[PDB]
């Protein structure tokens, strides 16, 4: 059960 992968943090978004 993962939302995010590895090198990220859901306080930004890769648009």
Curated annotation (Swiss-Prot):
It is found in: Cell membrane; Basolateral cell membrane. The modification Phosphotyrosine is found at residue 8. N-glycosylated. Detected in erythrocytes (at protein level). It comes from the Eukaryota. The modification N-acetylmethionine is found at residue 1. A dimer in solution, but in its membrane environment, it exists primarily as a mixture of dimers and tetramers and spans the membrane asymmetrically. Component of the ankyrin-1 complex in the erythrocyte, composed of ANK1, RHCE, RHAG, SLC4A1, EPB42, GYPA, GYPB and AQP1. Interacts with STOM; this interaction positively regulates SLC4A1 activity. Interacts with GYPA; a GYPA monomer is bound at each end of the SLC4A1 dimer forming a heterotetramer. Three SLC4A1 dimers (Band 3-I, Band 3-II and Band 3-III) participates in the ankyrin-1 complex. Functions both as a transporter that mediates electroneutral anion exchange across the cell membrane and as a structural protein. Component of the ankyrin-1 complex of the erythrocyte membrane; required for normal flexibility and stability of the erythrocyte membrane and for normal erythrocyte shape via the interactions of its cytoplasmic domain with cytoskeletal proteins, glycolytic enzymes, and hemoglobin. Functions as a transporter that mediates the 1:1 exchange of inorganic anions across the erythrocyte membrane. (Microbial infection) Acts as a receptor for P.falciparum (isolate 3D7) MSP9 and thus, facilitates merozoite invasion of erythrocytes. Acts as a receptor for P.falciparum (isolate 3D7) MSP1 and thus, facilitates merozoite invasion of erythrocytes. Belongs to the anion exchanger (TC 2.A.31) family. It is linked to Ovalocytosis, Southeast Asian: An autosomal dominant hematologic disorder characterized by ovalocytic erythrocytes that are rigid and exhibit reduced expression of many erythrocyte antigens. Clinical manifestations include mild hemolysis, intermittent jaundice and gallstones. However, the disorder is most often asymptomatic. Spherocytosis 4: An autosomal dominant form of spherocytosis, a group of hematologic disorders characterized by the presence of numerous abnormally shaped erythrocytes which are generally spheroidal. Affected individuals have anemia, jaundice, and splenomegaly. Clinical severity is variable. Some individuals are asymptomatic, whereas others have severe hemolytic anemia requiring erythrocyte transfusion. This is Band 3 anion transport protein. The chain holds residues 1 to 15 of 911 of the full protein.
């Amino acid at each position: 059960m993962e939302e995010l992968q590895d090198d990220y943090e859901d306080m930004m978004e890769e648009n």
